[PDB]
Amino acid sequence: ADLSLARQRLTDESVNEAPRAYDANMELVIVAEYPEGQCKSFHFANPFVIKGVIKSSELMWDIDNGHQMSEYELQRSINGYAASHSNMRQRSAINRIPKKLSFYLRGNVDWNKASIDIRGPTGLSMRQTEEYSLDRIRPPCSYKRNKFVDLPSCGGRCEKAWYVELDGRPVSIAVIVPRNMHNGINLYAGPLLGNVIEGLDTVPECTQWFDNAPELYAYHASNYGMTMLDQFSVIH
Amino acid sequence: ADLSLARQRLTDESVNEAPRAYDANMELVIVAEYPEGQCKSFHFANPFVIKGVIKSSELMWDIDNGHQMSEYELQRSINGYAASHSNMRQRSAINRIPKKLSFYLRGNVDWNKASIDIRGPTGLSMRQTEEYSLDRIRPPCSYKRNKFVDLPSCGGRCEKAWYVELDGRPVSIAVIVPRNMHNGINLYAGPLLGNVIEGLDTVPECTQWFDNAPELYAYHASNYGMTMLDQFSVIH
Amino acid sequence: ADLSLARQRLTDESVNEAPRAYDANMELVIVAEYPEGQCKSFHFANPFVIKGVIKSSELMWDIDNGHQMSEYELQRSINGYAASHSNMRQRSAINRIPKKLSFYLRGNVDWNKASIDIRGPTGLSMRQTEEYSLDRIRPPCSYKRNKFVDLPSCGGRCEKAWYVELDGRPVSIAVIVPRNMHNGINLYAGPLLGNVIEGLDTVPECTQWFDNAPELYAYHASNYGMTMLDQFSVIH
Ligand SMILES: Nc1ncnc2c1ncn2[C@@H]1O[C@H](COP(=O)(O)OP(=O)(O)OP(=O)(O)O)[C@@H](O)[C@H]1O
Ligand SMILES: Nc1ncnc2c1ncn2[C@@H]1O[C@H](COP(=O)(O)OP(=O)(O)OP(=O)(O)O)[C@@H](O)[C@H]1O
Ligand SMILES: Nc1ncnc2c1ncn2[C@@H]1O[C@H](COP(=O)(O)OP(=O)(O)OP(=O)(O)O)[C@@H](O)[C@H]1O
Ligand SMILES: [Mg+2]
Ligand SMILES: [Mg+2]
Ligand SMILES: [Mg+2]
Structure with a gap:
C-alpha cells in the first residue's frame, strides 16, 4: 500500500469527521439577500445548541451612502409595519427588507429537532394579529x-x-x-x-x-468551506 | 344554549389561558420615562426564565437633534458618576437619565421569585461605595x-x-x-x-x-395588549 | 481585647471573604492596550460561569477624531485579514489592533478549568488555515x-x-x-x-x-479594587 496515499486518506478523514467530536461546533450561516443583490451574513456556532437570534432592526439593509444607519432610524421604519400610522413614512421600506433568506447548517445536527422560526417585526409569534397573549416559541x-x-x-x-x-x-x-x-x-x-x-x-x-x-x-463560502446554492441551482 | 355565544366563550378562554402552556412566553416590558416626557421601552420574553439585562448606556435617552448617540459618548457621561473627575463635564447629565422606571410583567410568572435588581452605573451591586469584593446577584x-x-x-x-x-x-x-x-x-x-x-x-x-x-x-400598549398605568392612575 | 480593633478585623474579613458566598460574583476585566497607549476595558461578572465573549470588531480601537466608528467600517478592515483581497485597503490596520491583552480574574474561580481562547477574526478556532470543519471550543x-x-x-x-x-x-x-x-x-x-x-x-x-x-x-482599577500590573511590573 502506498503510504503517501494512506496519509492523504487519514488527513481527509480527520477533516471530514472532526465535527462529530465532543466540543466541536455545529455551524449556522444565515444569509439575507436584498433587492439590489447585496447580502448580509450572520454566523453562529456552538457544540450543544446554536441559538441564532436576530432582531428585525439587524435584518434590514442598513447602509446609506456608505454609512451604517442607527437602530433608532431602522426601528422607526419598522414601526409602521407593526402598528398602523406609528411613524411618518409616506412610502414603504421594501428597498431595505430582504427578498430571500437562506439558512446554512453544517455539522452534527439533530435534524429532527432543528427549528427555524420566522417571527414578527417586534419579536412576537407571527400571525395575522400579533398579541402578547398568544406568544410562544417552537411552533x-x-x-x-x-x-x-x-x-x-x-x-x-x-x-x-x-x-x-x-x-x-x-x-x-x-x-x-x-x-x-x-x-x-x-x-x-x-x-x-x-x-x-x-x-x-x-x-x-x-x-x-x-x-x-x-x-x-x-470571500466567505469558499474561504471557510460552507457550500452555498445560487438562484441557478449552482453550488459555490 | 346559543352556540354563537358558546363559540365566543371558547375563543375568549383560548386567548386568556394560552400563556399557561408549555413553551408559552412570559412577557416583560420595561419603560423608562425622561424629564421631557419621552419614553424608551425594552421588551423581553421567554417561557422559562426571562433575563432582562440593560446596561447603563442603554438606559440613557440617546437621541440628540434627531440622531442616535454612540455608546462611547454615553459612557463618557456616565463615567463621572461612577468615578470622581473621570470625564470633563462641567454640568450634570440629568436631562438624559430616567425620572421613572416601570416594569410590566405578564404571564405565568412565579411572583414569589421574580427579582428586579437596580444596579450601579457600571453593573456592580448598588451601595454607597461600590467595589468588586462586594458584588453579588439576587439581593x-x-x-x-x-x-x-x-x-x-x-x-x-x-x-x-x-x-x-x-x-x-x-x-x-x-x-x-x-x-x-x-x-x-x-x-x-x-x-x-x-x-x-x-x-x-x-x-x-x-x-x-x-x-x-x-x-x-x-402604538405599543394597546396594539399588543399590555395594560399600562399613567401618572393619574388611569389605565391604557 | 480592644473592641474597636476587633470590629475593624471583622469588617476586613467580611469584605475579604464575601466573594466565596453563594450568588457572589466572580469578576473578569479584559484590557486591550493599543500602540498609542490608549486602553479599552471590558467587564463581565457571574457567580457560576463568566462567559466573556468579544467579537473582533469590538476589540478594535474604534474612535476616529472623537467619534465612534460603526461595526460596518470596522468589519470591512478586519475582512482583509480573514480573506485575501476582500476589501480595498492599500495599507494595514495595525494602528487599531491591540498590542497586548491583559485578563484580570478575581473571586472564587476554578483555576484548574478557567479557559481563555484567542480565536480568529471571524470567530473560528485559530490555526494557519481556518475552516468550518475544524472549529471547536475549549482547546x-x-x-x-x-x-x-x-x-x-x-x-x-x-x-x-x-x-x-x-x-x-x-x-x-x-x-x-x-x-x-x-x-x-x-x-x-x-x-x-x-x-x-x-x-x-x-x-x-x-x-x-x-x-x-x-x-x-x-478611574477603574483603584476605584473598584482590581489590582493591575504595568509594563514596569509595578502594581496599581
Ligand atoms: N447543484 C446542486 N443543486 C442542488 N443539490 C445538489 C447540487 N449538487 C449536489 N447536490 C446535492 O448535495 C448532496 C450531496 O452531494 P454529494 O454527495 O455529491 O457531495 P459531497 O461532496 O460528497 O458531500 P457530502 O460529504 O456532504 O455528501 C446530494 O443530495 C446532491 O443531490
Ligand atoms: N385604574 C386603576 N388603577 C390601579 N389599579 C387598577 C385600576 N383599574 C383596575 N385596577 C386593578 O387591576 C386588577 C384587575 O382588575 P379587573 O379584575 O377589573 O381586570 P380584568 O380586565 O378582569 O383583568 P384580569 O383578568 O387580569 O383580572 C384589580 O386588582 C384592580 O383593582
Ligand atoms: N509588583 C509585583 N509584581 C508581580 N507580582 C507581585 C507584585 N507585588 C506582589 N506580587 C505578587 O502578588 C501575590 C500576592 O501578594 P501579597 O500577598 O503581598 O498581596 P495581598 O495584598 O496580601 O493580597 P492577597 O490577599 O491576594 O494575598 C504574591 O505572589 C506576590 O509575589
Ligand atoms: Mg457525498
Ligand atoms: Mg379580573
Ligand atoms: Mg497576601
Whole structure:
C-alpha cells in the first residue's frame, strides 16, 4: 500500500469527521439577500445548541451612502409595519427588507429537532394579529426535518439548507439547532451537565456585509468551506 | 344554549389561558420615562426564565437633534458618576437619565421569585461605595412579591407591575423572571431538562423610542395588549 | 481585647471573604492596550460561569477624531485579514489592533478549568488555515492553570492575571470562568439546578475607553479594587 496515499486518506478523514467530536461546533450561516443583490451574513456556532437570534432592526439593509444607519432610524421604519400610522413614512421600506433568506447548517445536527422560526417585526409569534397573549416559541411549523435541502459538504455528509421568500414585511428570527444525540447518550445527564452548561453561548458571532453574492461566495463560502446554492441551482 | 355565544366563550378562554402552556412566553416590558416626557421601552420574553439585562448606556435617552448617540459618548457621561473627575463635564447629565422606571410583567410568572435588581452605573451591586469584593446577584430586596401592583390583563388574571423613581444617577438593570411551577412539577428534572435549556434566551429583544407617553400607549400598549398605568392612575 | 480593633478585623474579613458566598460574583476585566497607549476595558461578572465573549470588531480601537466608528467600517478592515483581497485597503490596520491583552480574574474561580481562547477574526478556532470543519471550543491550550500570574487582592487571596502579546492580526475572544466547587459539592446536582440556571448571564456588561493607562488605573482599577500590573511590573 502506498503510504503517501494512506496519509492523504487519514488527513481527509480527520477533516471530514472532526465535527462529530465532543466540543466541536455545529455551524449556522444565515444569509439575507436584498433587492439590489447585496447580502448580509450572520454566523453562529456552538457544540450543544446554536441559538441564532436576530432582531428585525439587524435584518434590514442598513447602509446609506456608505454609512451604517442607527437602530433608532431602522426601528422607526419598522414601526409602521407593526402598528398602523406609528411613524411618518409616506412610502414603504421594501428597498431595505430582504427578498430571500437562506439558512446554512453544517455539522452534527439533530435534524429532527432543528427549528427555524420566522417571527414578527417586534419579536412576537407571527400571525395575522400579533398579541402578547398568544406568544410562544417552537411552533410545530418551525421544525423543518425532511424539508431541509441536502448540499455537498465535501466529505462531511453534514450540510443542509433551508430557503424562504419574504413578502415585503420586516421579520425577526429565532433558530434553535440542537446537537445529534441519536447515539443513545444524554449529554445533559449526570456529572457532564455542568460542562455542557459552561459551553453554551461561548462563541463570538460575526456579521458581514457584501455588495453582491459573488463577493459572498468568494470571500466567505469558499474561504471557510460552507457550500452555498445560487438562484441557478449552482453550488459555490 | 346559543352556540354563537358558546363559540365566543371558547375563543375568549383560548386567548386568556394560552400563556399557561408549555413553551408559552412570559412577557416583560420595561419603560423608562425622561424629564421631557419621552419614553424608551425594552421588551423581553421567554417561557422559562426571562433575563432582562440593560446596561447603563442603554438606559440613557440617546437621541440628540434627531440622531442616535454612540455608546462611547454615553459612557463618557456616565463615567463621572461612577468615578470622581473621570470625564470633563462641567454640568450634570440629568436631562438624559430616567425620572421613572416601570416594569410590566405578564404571564405565568412565579411572583414569589421574580427579582428586579437596580444596579450601579457600571453593573456592580448598588451601595454607597461600590467595589468588586462586594458584588453579588439576587439581593433580598430585589424580590418584590406582594409589592407588585396588580393591573387588568383583560381575562388573563396575569399582569402585575412595579414602579421606581430614580434620583438623578445612572443605573443598570437586571430582571430575572422565573416560570410558575407551583403545580408541583419540576421542569428541570429528568429528560425534559435539555428541552428547557434549548429554549432559554431564544426570543429577539425589541427596543423602541417614543416622544411622549400617549404614543407608547397608542402604538405599543394597546396594539399588543399590555395594560399600562399613567401618572393619574388611569389605565391604557 | 480592644473592641474597636476587633470590629475593624471583622469588617476586613467580611469584605475579604464575601466573594466565596453563594450568588457572589466572580469578576473578569479584559484590557486591550493599543500602540498609542490608549486602553479599552471590558467587564463581565457571574457567580457560576463568566462567559466573556468579544467579537473582533469590538476589540478594535474604534474612535476616529472623537467619534465612534460603526461595526460596518470596522468589519470591512478586519475582512482583509480573514480573506485575501476582500476589501480595498492599500495599507494595514495595525494602528487599531491591540498590542497586548491583559485578563484580570478575581473571586472564587476554578483555576484548574478557567479557559481563555484567542480565536480568529471571524470567530473560528485559530490555526494557519481556518475552516468550518475544524472549529471547536475549549482547546487544551486554553486552560492556563499555573500559567496564571498571582497578584495582590488586598486580603482576598483571589486575584490572578494572564497576558498575551498580539502579532498584528485581529482576533476574537472567548473566556469561560467556572466557579470553584472543590469543596466537594455539585451545585448543578439536585433541586438547586434551576436556581443556578436562573442566575446565568444576568449581570450587565460594561465597556470603557481610556486615552492612557494611568486613566485606567485611577478611574477603574483603584476605584473598584482590581489590582493591575504595568509594563514596569509595578502594581496599581
Ligand atoms: N447543484 C446542486 N443543486 C442542488 N443539490 C445538489 C447540487 N449538487 C449536489 N447536490 C446535492 O448535495 C448532496 C450531496 O452531494 P454529494 O454527495 O455529491 O457531495 P459531497 O461532496 O460528497 O458531500 P457530502 O460529504 O456532504 O455528501 C446530494 O443530495 C446532491 O443531490
Ligand atoms: N385604574 C386603576 N388603577 C390601579 N389599579 C387598577 C385600576 N383599574 C383596575 N385596577 C386593578 O387591576 C386588577 C384587575 O382588575 P379587573 O379584575 O377589573 O381586570 P380584568 O380586565 O378582569 O383583568 P384580569 O383578568 O387580569 O383580572 C384589580 O386588582 C384592580 O383593582
Ligand atoms: N509588583 C509585583 N509584581 C508581580 N507580582 C507581585 C507584585 N507585588 C506582589 N506580587 C505578587 O502578588 C501575590 C500576592 O501578594 P501579597 O500577598 O503581598 O498581596 P495581598 O495584598 O496580601 O493580597 P492577597 O490577599 O491576594 O494575598 C504574591 O505572589 C506576590 O509575589
Ligand atoms: Mg457525498
Ligand atoms: Mg379580573
Ligand atoms: Mg497576601
